[PDB]
């Protein structure tokens, strides 16, 4: 309140009225002793009820503008994370076996369900039981999707390496059974 431009009048009117109490004041000067700090006090309160509103308004943009900054800084951290993805899932397209089906296409459009089926290098087979295993993945090589795949690893549900000799007809009760066979393309 030490810089409000209505402190001078209030201060002076207080001094004139209050400080001059000991001195004999007649009933005519008493009006000046009374109706001089009055009105001035009203105006000061008016000069303080507007300052309090300007302060709050001000401290509602120095908070709503930190939030406009925060979000743009964030908008630049996700815009650079999707970019770092769509350029890492691209360096992975064996562009000899992929430009060989987009080319044999009538216009260059192909179904998406035949891209991993004809242009992939690895196969993952998930097998529930032993009966399913001998009709799908018997031996070290097997044919699927008009191709030939050679087994490379057989992990299990626990993710521990199984060998192709632990898989018997009677040792089967001793394996975590969802078995995951990883195979590579041949030729």
């Amino acid at each position: 309140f030490s810089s409000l431009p209505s402190y001078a009048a209030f201060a002076t009117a207080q001094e004139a009225y209050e400080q001059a109490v000991a001195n004999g004041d007649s009933e005519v000067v008493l009006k000046k002793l009374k109706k001089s700090l009055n009105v001035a006090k009203s105006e000061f309160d008016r000069d303080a009820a507007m300052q309090r509103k300007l302060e709050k308004m001000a401290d509602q943009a120095m908070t709503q503008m930190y939030k406009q900054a925060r979000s743009e800084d964030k908008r630049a951290k996700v815009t650079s994370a999707m970019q770092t993805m769509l350029f890492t899932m691209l360096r992975k397209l064996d562009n000899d076996a992929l430009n060989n089906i987009i080319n044999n296409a009538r216009d260059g459009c192909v179904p998406l369900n035949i891209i991993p089926l004809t242009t992939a290098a690895k196969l993952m087979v998930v097998i529930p039981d032993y009966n399913t295993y001998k009709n799908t993945c018997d031996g070290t090589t097997f044919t699927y999707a008009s191709a030939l795949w050679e087994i490379q690893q057989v992990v299990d549900a626990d993710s521990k390496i199984v060998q192709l000799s632990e898989i018997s007809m009677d040792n089967s009760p001793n394996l975590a059974w969802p078995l995951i066979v990883t195979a590579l393309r041949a030729n």
Binding site: M82, I102, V110, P111, K122, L123, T136, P178
Partner: protein, 620 residues
């Protein structure tokens, strides 16, 4: 309807997104530029550019969400656990997710036992628990989609039912709204696949300006954007030891669907006195108003309610297209005939025949609803009215027309055959007449595949109105399920209310000077909700006493029950809230010299704060 039948002849690997190679600053990308629907045929995007330089924000959100790049950089997958078509494996390992048991609130159980509960041969037992699951739970729940079979419909009958069904939705308004008029609650919830890696829905609703959202929404009226859905197991109390999974759809789908449907989905939730009771409350007399609106002015009234076996998995793909075309009939000035197709194909490509993520692998959904889409409860109510109007057509048209004594219900049966099989355009004078016949003799109250019917009991016995046997025949050829008549109920005395609606029973009590209807729960559900929880929650009652004030509000109308073992569940909850308050105000006086004042706390163990929730003259 013809494409549905003809698409069972063609290889299943020809349906799905159609991809092509584009260049964005001299690098080859594979992106989706169309779709092949088993029902809508081949659709081609309208704004596709082959040579671009820079990708904006609205052009990176449409490239990350597409399955075209995720399923063209992952390994081939052959999954023999399921019989659904499988696309790719996104990683080198298969994820197995389990479900944990519940937590035991031993203090509440000790308190209840010390008050004469859980005695041998008691009426109230514990039947709701937290059931645990092993790692083969998500795939075994996904494999329940084998109940969705291709279904050809009767088109001359469905084209009339769809016109009697769009009269239950005539008192609402709807349309498209701008991105600044959209209301979202709980912005701290998931945002889908390709994105739950970087934040919740708040991040994507803040990073996108209003004009970005408007541009994205106007993009889908000329193009098709396929998305990926994630299947998530649930951790909740139940009575069946079977897993529950929900579908968390992507953010590009929800964001653009909320500007298409939200103006109508919030006018449905604001109408009182209609057939669809979504939005109405059970408190402050709402359950009495709802039950006296359905009773209307019927004559010889009986009450009926039925069941929908495997509702979301078995619902045909032609009754889910027909629900999106009834909700989109309100966009008749805001959108054009071509803008309303690309907003229909966009819905099918995203919530009807999409690609789902179960574990770390992509599968193909055969059909059926997704709980997680915006318009679910509202599209489940259009399907519930459609199956109850076609039961009333099949009951009147299969009734020997010579034995009908009445002469008004004999020319109304003679003009319905004409309107079905001898007319080709809509006759809006028999539709308005059948719609009044139904409303007069067959009154319904629908909440998202839960329904209660008050019907004439001297018309359903003659055969002029649907019965329970007429719902068991329609669900067999139109829905591919068998509805056993031991999951449906009937009620002859209307002073006892429906047997069950929304898991709640009904009872006629005397309140004030008049008799009202009050809903009450299953006691084993409210008792078992205080014993089994999720740690720090209620394994210490003093840290949350608001959980037991919101559970004694639900247990209040048990005080009026004729069984005295049911009326004790409410007095046990009022005696525990006081125990948890003496402790709290007595635990902060013996370790910290604090003295709490019991002023305005005694209202929660007095039976007058809860009695005011079931009396009209709403407050707050």
């Amino acid at each position: 309807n013809f494409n549905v039948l003809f698409s069972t002849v063609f290889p299943p690997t020809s349906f799905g997104p159609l991809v092509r190679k584009i260049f964005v600053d001299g690098v080859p990308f594979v992106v989706s530029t169309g779709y092949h629907f088993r029902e809508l045929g081949v659709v081609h995007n309208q704004d596709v550019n082959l040579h671009s330089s820079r990708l904006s924000f609205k052009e990176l959100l449409v490239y990350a969400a597409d399955p075209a790049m995720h399923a063209a950089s992952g390994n081939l997958l052959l999954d023999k656990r399921t019989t659904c078509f499988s696309v790719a494996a996104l990683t080198n390992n298969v994820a197995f997710q389990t479900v944990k048991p519940g937590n035991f609130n031993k203090d509440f159980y000790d308190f209840a036992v010390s008050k004469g509960f859980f005695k041998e041969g008691s009426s109230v037992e514990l039947k709701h628990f937290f059931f645990a699951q092993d790692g083969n739970a998500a795939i075994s729940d996904y494999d329940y989609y084998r109940y969705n079979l291709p279904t050809m419909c009767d088109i001359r009958q469905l084209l009339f039912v769809v016109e009697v069904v769009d009269k239950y939705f005539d008192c609402y308004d709807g349309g498209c709204i701008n991105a600044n008029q959209v209301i979202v609650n709980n912005l701290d919830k998931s945002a889908g696949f390709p994105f739950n890696k970087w934040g919740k829905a708040r991040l994507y609703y803040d990073s996108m300006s209003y004009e970005d959202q408007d541009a994205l929404f106007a993009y889908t009226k000329r193009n098709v954007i396929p998305t990926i859905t994630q299947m998530n197991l649930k951790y909740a109390i139940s009575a069946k030891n079977r897993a529950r999974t929900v579908a968390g759809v992507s953010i590009c789908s929800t964001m653009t669907n909320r500007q298409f449907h939200q103006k109508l989905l919030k006018s449905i939730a604001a109408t009182r006195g209609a057939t669809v009771v979504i939005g109405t409350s059970k408190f402050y007399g709402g359950w009495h108003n709802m039950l006296k609106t359905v009773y209307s002015d019927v004559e010889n009234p009986h009450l009926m309610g039925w069941d929908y076996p495997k509702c979301d998995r078995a619902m045909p793909n032609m009754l889910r297209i027909m629900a999106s075309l009834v909700l989109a009939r309100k966009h008749t000035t805001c959108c054009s005939l071509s803008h309303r197709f690309y907003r229909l194909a966009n819905e099918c490509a995203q919530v009807l025949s999409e690609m789902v993520m179960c574990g770390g692998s992509l599968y193909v959904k055969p059909g059926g609803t997704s709980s997680g889409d915006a318009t679910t409860a509202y599209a489940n109510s259009v399907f519930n009215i459609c199956q109850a109007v076609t039961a009333n057509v099949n009951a009147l048209l299969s009734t020997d027309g010579n034995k009908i004594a009445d002469k008004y219900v004999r020319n109304l049966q003679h003009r319905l055959y004409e309107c079905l099989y001898r007319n080709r355009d809509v006759d809006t004078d028999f539709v308005n007449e059948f719609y009044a016949y139904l409303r007069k003799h067959f009154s319904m109250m629908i909440l998202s595949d839960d329904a209660v019917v008050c019907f004439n009991s001297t018309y359903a016995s003659q055969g002029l109105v649907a019965s329970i046997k007429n719902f068991k025949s329609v669900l067999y050829y139109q829905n591919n399920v068998f509805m056993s008549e031991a999951k449906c109920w009937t009620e002859t005395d209307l002073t006892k209310g429906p047997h069950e609606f929304c898991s709640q029973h009904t009872m006629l009590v005397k309140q004030g000077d008049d008799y009202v209807y009050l809903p009450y729960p299953d006691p084993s559900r409210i008792l078992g909700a205080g014993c089994f929880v999720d740690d720090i929650v209620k394994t210490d009652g003093t840290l949350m006493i608001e959980r037991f004030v919101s559970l004694a509000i639900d247990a209040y109308p048990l005080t009026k029950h004729p069984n005295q073992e049911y009326a004790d569940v409410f007095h046990l909850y009022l005696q525990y809230i006081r125990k948890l308050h003496d402790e709290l105000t007595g635990h902060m006086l013996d370790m910290y010299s604090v003295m709490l004042t019991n002023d305005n706390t005694s209202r929660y163990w007095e039976p007058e704060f809860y009695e005011a929730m079931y009396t009209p003259h709403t407050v707050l």
